[PDB]
Design a protein around this nucleic acid. Structure first.
Ligand SMILES: [Mg+2]
Ligand SMILES: [Mg+2]
Ligand SMILES: [Mg+2]
Ligand SMILES: [Mg+2]
Ligand SMILES: [Mg+2]
Lengths: 47, 100, 206, 357
RNA sequence: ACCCGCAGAAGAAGCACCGGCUAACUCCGUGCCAGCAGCCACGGUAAUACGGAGGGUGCAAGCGUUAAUCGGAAUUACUG
RNA sequence: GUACGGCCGCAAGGUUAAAACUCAAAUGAAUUGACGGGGGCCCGCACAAGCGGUGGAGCAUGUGGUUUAAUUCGAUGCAACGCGAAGAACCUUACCUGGUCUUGACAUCCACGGAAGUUUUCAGAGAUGAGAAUGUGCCUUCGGGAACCGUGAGACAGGUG
RNA sequence: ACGACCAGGGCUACACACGUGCUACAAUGGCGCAUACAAAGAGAAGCGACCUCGCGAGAGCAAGCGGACCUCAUAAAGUGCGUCGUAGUCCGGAUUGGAGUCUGCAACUCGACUCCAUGAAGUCGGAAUCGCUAGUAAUCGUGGAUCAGAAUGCCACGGUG
RNA sequence: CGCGGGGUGGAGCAGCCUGGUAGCUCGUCGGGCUCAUAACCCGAAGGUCGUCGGUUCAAAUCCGGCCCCCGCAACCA
RNA sequence: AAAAUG
């Protein structure tokens, strides 16, 4: 099962190259309560 | 602190209660200038042999309610925070949120 | 979270002392601990029966403990044998022979602790928390409380974030030192977490 | 204390045993011996050669791990008699043949670190930081420190060669050389992208972060600059220079072309007037081109090797450093370590053997 | 075609869905993985949204699905 | 308002005017905020005016970093850094290198055999493990229970994880 | 067994980087010799006058005080003389060793203190930065709490000011 | 291979002309500033002077061999 | 006069 290498024709280091493409992104939690937190409509919504 | 910790000091306390007079006498003769040298030597080894838990040195006084050794008090016998908690509830006689 | 504990700032002003005994520095700490133990025992025993607080007094090495309760029918019981039994355990805890006195609180909803306990109970048997709080406040108002502030904190309705929720009715002068602020806290051991029920009740101005 | 160590050793052996297939290689050995015991087996030499040695190599594993189970018990029994009767010599003889067993285990352990062309050679590792901007950099430095600690614990010379520090705090890229006995063997299996989960100190709102940093480990190769091309491999041909020069250039075989016979690469020169300068200049050029050919073939082989590794994909994400829940889960390990502070202080002994397996 | 006689439930029920829209919600792996999805994005170790089990809802020898066309679009408005 | 084509243009370009693909918004007004190297007002040892510091040195202490078998853990702009540890010799203490105990170190429920306690002998770093001398409280138609240890089974403990 | 019991090591590492406290660099001083002012505390498994011996910390000896009475404790700066004459000093006391005293099972990693010596850096501190509006800062001492034992910390009391 | 010019702390430049005695800017490291980073302010470290011989009391400095780079030349046919 | 970025 392939991954479409955003980098393409990988010549030198495969690991490093991959780590520098969308597959190993910087992933950020959308936490509640604080900063970058507010949701207009919740997961289940207002009742 | 832990229950284990509490148990430890309880054990130590018990040992102290048991062994004190025996400990005391040895201390006394160690102190004594008018005493035999060999006898003194004998006393010192006795003391060395006799339990470490029996000593008042190993007695790290803890909170008598929770178990915290840090923030101990000879007036109340509790943790500082715990004392404060008690105080505010009115559970301590005398202790006023006071100013001077 | 910030403020003074009102019962501790008023302990020599309007609030009478919960601990009313003299002991030397040599014999203070241990006595205090014994008292605490007795309190704990009382809490364990009379949680199903409605109790608020106890006042401890020991003259001539013979303790009299004053108990503030809502209903004397379950607290004393049908006979004074249960009371005697209770006393025995207190005596055992403390050292010296024990005597007790009971006090029925007039207007049970005027006292905060009982109300808090009730709220906790409600929370435990799964009722709408907000609604319960509102009901409590209403009851207090009916009873003739000049002011009532209730406050619950955290894990309300099994939410992933803590919920701070509070109702305020009448006048609750937390800053007035001559005010009779009756403040108590009961912390609910719910399935979802711990909810801390805080309650101030303003009784009168003296 | 010694008897409990025996049991530990036994346990270690047992765990080793499953992966090396005690129940399958013993069955494999059954079938070889069914054919090779017959005198008519050398009808086919080609297959028999490949099987003959194979069986010999597999006998040194199955039967020896049976001589281990048989061994530990005997030594234990040897120990028991002596201690009970207060005899001393047997105590010493009980330790000395347990001693053999550790060496055997090491050899079997060595056999895992023996598989491969490059193992005992000098070792290099590149810790490249991810896309985090700051978090990634922070992670990378941590990783580096962990590696250093590991090196210290094992007992190796650790030489930081290139160190590009973070824009705020951390490491963007770092190349460290680690020299010594089977230095690459321990570190070959560490190669991969490291998944760090953390509550970040750089986020003002204090968000939780899934961060990555590659730790590409590669061994130091022999230099092999250029093979000295012998005259039997070169094809030297001379001809006339193209252009102007009256009677002189029209009548010179000054221009030269050199062709490498097995390759087909051809280098010409018609620069200088002399044949002999050109011959050596076009050879210098021919040598240069040969290097390129050999450099390019090595690079393409590398490229193809790495495109295999690329097609592993998400498998490069090896070890999940869940610091926000303390426990660390490596993909091949199947075990969690509740002491992150020991893991970070270079105690990856729990992770090397499992990933190598 | 239809009608007369015979035994016995005998041989004829299941798919789609249950976050909100959109009628119907809880538990077990799972954990920004796998997966979901018409749209607003669920999934980051308590998922009423994944996947299963139990409990439903609504259809019904079906039911979804994509497609196609119109509507809702008063999103080409002569009506408007 | 771009491509291509046309028409116009000396040229610059203008004019007419798409499609594919792509996104779930794109905006408009207004509202609460926050922010402004906008404006106005006021205030704080905020500046100014002053008084001494620190930073340079040695010493105490705490952190980090490296290191160590282990350097318990937490605290991290102010609002972490003589902080939690109002007191790390042992203990504390959580940690490491060893030696040890598995209903547990601490509880409660037992079933029973034995009242607790009192005195000592050796080995060991000690945890502890045996041995030898001394012992037997309140009522009891008095089986026994209240106390204190041993034993085995489970409930369950427990954890400064 | 990420559980517990013990023993030691540690948490006091050490090329360093920082923070925070203290003593410093001097003659408003350093020391020697006379002398003045307290406040606030803390105490009966405690404090410990008097007398004696110790350079001395401390011992013996033997009263009193559950303690405005007995004590811990003489407050120290200040004042009154004497010196030294701006030196790395009669500055500063670090460090490194020696000789002793308590405390506790025990100071070796690891307590102070009595003493003898020793005399490192430092001659007011780069960039930068910090506190304080009056009994305030600045500065000198005195307690206490956690303490068998051990504060330059912290809480407080007072002197100059 | 010819003639000429260089190779100097991590980068680029002097200093070599005429012997003694190593500077400049950027970085590097350390502090500071700021919520942080960048800039800026302060402090510090870093050199067998391409390599090897020689002469000279002594060589980066002079001379020669060797290596690397740059330039010019490499012609009439 | 000075304040680039997150
Ligand atoms: Mg619904
Ligand atoms: Mg329409
Ligand atoms: Mg146009
Ligand atoms: Mg300094
Ligand atoms: Mg410094």
């Amino acid at each position: 099962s392939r991954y479409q290498h955003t980098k393409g024709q990988i010549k030198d280091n495969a690991i490093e190259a991959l780590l520098h493409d969308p597959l190993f992104r910087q992933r950020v939690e959308k936490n509640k309560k604080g900063k970058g937190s507010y949701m207009r409509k919740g997961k289940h919504g207002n009742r | 602190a832990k229950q284990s910790m509490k148990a430890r000091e309880v054990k130590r306390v018990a040992l102290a209660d048991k062994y004190f007079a025996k400990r005391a006498e040895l201390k006394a003769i160690i102190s004594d200038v008018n005493a035999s040298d060999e006898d003194r030597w004998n006393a010192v080894l006795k003391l060395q042999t006799l339990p470490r838990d029996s000593s008042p040195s190993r007695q790290r006084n803890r909170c008598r309610q929770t178990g915290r050794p840090h923030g101990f008090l000879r007036k109340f016998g509790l943790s500082r925070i715990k004392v404060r908690e008690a105080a505010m509830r009115g559970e301590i006689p005398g202790l006023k949120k006071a100013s001077w | 979270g910030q403020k003074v504990h009102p019962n501790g700032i008023r302990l020599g002003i309007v609030k009478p002392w919960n601990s009313t005994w003299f002991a030397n520095t040599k014999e203070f700490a241990d006595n205090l601990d014994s008292d605490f133990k007795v309190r704990q025992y009382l809490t364990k025993e009379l949680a199903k029966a409605s109790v608020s607080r106890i006042v401890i007094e020991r003259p001539a090495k013979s303790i009299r403990v004053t108990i503030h309760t809502a209903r004397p029918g379950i607290v004393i019981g049908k006979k004074g044998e249960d009371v005697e039994k209770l006393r025995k355990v207190v005596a055992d805890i403390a050292g010296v022979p024990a005597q007790i006195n009971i006090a029925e609180v007039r207007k049970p909803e005027l006292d905060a602790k009982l109300v808090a306990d009730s709220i906790t109970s409600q929370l435990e048997r799964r009722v709408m928390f907000r609604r319960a709080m509102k009901r409590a406040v209403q009851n207090a108002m009916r009873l003739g409380a000049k002011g009532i502030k209730v406050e619950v904190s955290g894990r309300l309705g099994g939410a992933e974030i803590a919920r701070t929720e509070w109702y305020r009715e009448g006048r609750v002068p937390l800053h007035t030192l001559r005010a009779d602020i009756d403040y108590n806290t009961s912390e609910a051991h719910t399935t979802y977490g711990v909810i801390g029920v805080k309650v101030w009740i303003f009784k009168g101005e003296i | 204390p010694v008897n409990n160590r025996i049991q530990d050793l036994t346990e270690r052996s047992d765990v080793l045993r499953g992966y090396l297939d005690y129940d399958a290689k013993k069955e494999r050995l059954e079938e070889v011996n069914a054919e090779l015991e017959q005198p008519d087996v050398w009808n086919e030499p080609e297959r028999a050669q490949a099987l003959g040695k194979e069986r010999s190599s597999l006998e040194a594993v199955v039967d020896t791990l049976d001589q281990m189970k048989q061994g530990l018990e005997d030594v234990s029994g040897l120990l028991e008699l002596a201690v009970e009767a207060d005899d001393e010599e047997t105590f010493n003889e009980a330790v000395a043949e347990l001693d053999a067993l550790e060496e055997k285990l090491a050899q079997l352990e060595f056999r895992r670190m023996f598989s491969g062309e490059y193992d005992s050679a000098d070792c290099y590792l590149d810790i490249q930081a991810g896309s985090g901007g700051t978090e990634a950099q922070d992670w990378a430095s941590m990783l580096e420190r962990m590696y250093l600690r590991w090196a210290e614990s094992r007992g190796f010379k650790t030489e930081i060669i290139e160190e590009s520090e973070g824009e705020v705090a951390g490491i963007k890229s770092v190349t460290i050389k680690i020299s010594g006995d089977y230095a690459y063997g321990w570190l070959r299996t560490e190669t991969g992208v490291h998944r760090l989960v953390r509550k970040s100190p750089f986020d003002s709102g204090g968000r939780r972060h899934t961060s990555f940093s590659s730790a590409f480990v590669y061994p130091e190769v022999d230099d092999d600059i250029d093979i000295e091309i012998n005259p039997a491999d070169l094809r030297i041909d001379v001809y006339r220079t193209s252009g102007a020069g009256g009677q002189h250039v029209n009548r010179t075989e000054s221009a030269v072309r050199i062709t490498h016979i097995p390759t087909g690469i051809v280098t010409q020169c018609q620069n200088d007037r002399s044949q002999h300068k050109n011959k050596d200049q076009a050879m210098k050029q021919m040598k240069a081109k040969l290097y390129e050919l050999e450099m390019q073939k090595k690079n393409a082989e590398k490229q193809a090797m790495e495109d295999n590794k690329s097609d592993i994909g998400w498998g490069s994400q090896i070890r999940s450093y869940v610091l926000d829940d303390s426990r660390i889960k490596d993909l091949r390990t199947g075990v969690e370590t509740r002491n992150t502070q020991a893991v970070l202080d270079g105690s990856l002994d729990q992770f090397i053997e499992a990933s190598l397996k």
